[PDB]
Design a protein around this ligand. Sequence first.
Ligand SMILES: [Zn+2]
Lengths: 30, 68, 72
Amino acid sequence: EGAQWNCTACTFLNHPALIRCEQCEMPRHF
Amino acid sequence: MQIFVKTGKTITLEVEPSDTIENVKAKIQDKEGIPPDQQRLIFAGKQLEDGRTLSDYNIQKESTLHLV
Amino acid sequence: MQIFVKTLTGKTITLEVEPSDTIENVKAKIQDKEGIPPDQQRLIFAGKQLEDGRTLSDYNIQKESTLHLVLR
Ligand SMILES: [Zn+2]
C-alpha cells in the first residue's frame, strides 16, 4: 500500500488508504 | 451515542460510547449490507481493529469514520 | 510567547500564549479575534489533532510555532 501522509493543508497525518484529508477533505495529490 | 460513517453516501449510527469495533461493523452490515469481513474502518489516520472498542480510539460524539 | 494560527484560507493569526495554556484556552483566544466558537474549530499540529484537555507544553509547542485551524 503506502505510508501515513501529511495533509499539505493542515499537516494532519492521514492514512494511506485515504485520498482526501480526514480533517479538511483536501486531496492528497495536486 | 451517534456517529457517522463516510462510505460517497453517509450513514448515521446509534451505538454505545464503548461499543467494540466488531459491534459497529455488525450494525453497518444491517444498514448497508456490507459484510464485516469486507469492510475497513479508518479514523485518526489509524485503522480500527475489530479487537478493540470505540472508547479506545477516543471516538467522541458525532465522530466521523471512513469505510474502505 | 507569540505563536501563529494559519487558517485554511492562507490567513495567519498572531496569538500570545503561555506554555502552560490548555487547548481550550487557545481556542478561546482565537474566538476573541475571529468570533469562531471553540466547538466549531479544530487545531492540528505536528500532524495531530489537539485535545481540549492537554496544554501547549504537553504537545511541546515552542515559541514562534504555528498551528493550523480547520473548521468543523
Ligand atoms: Zn488538513
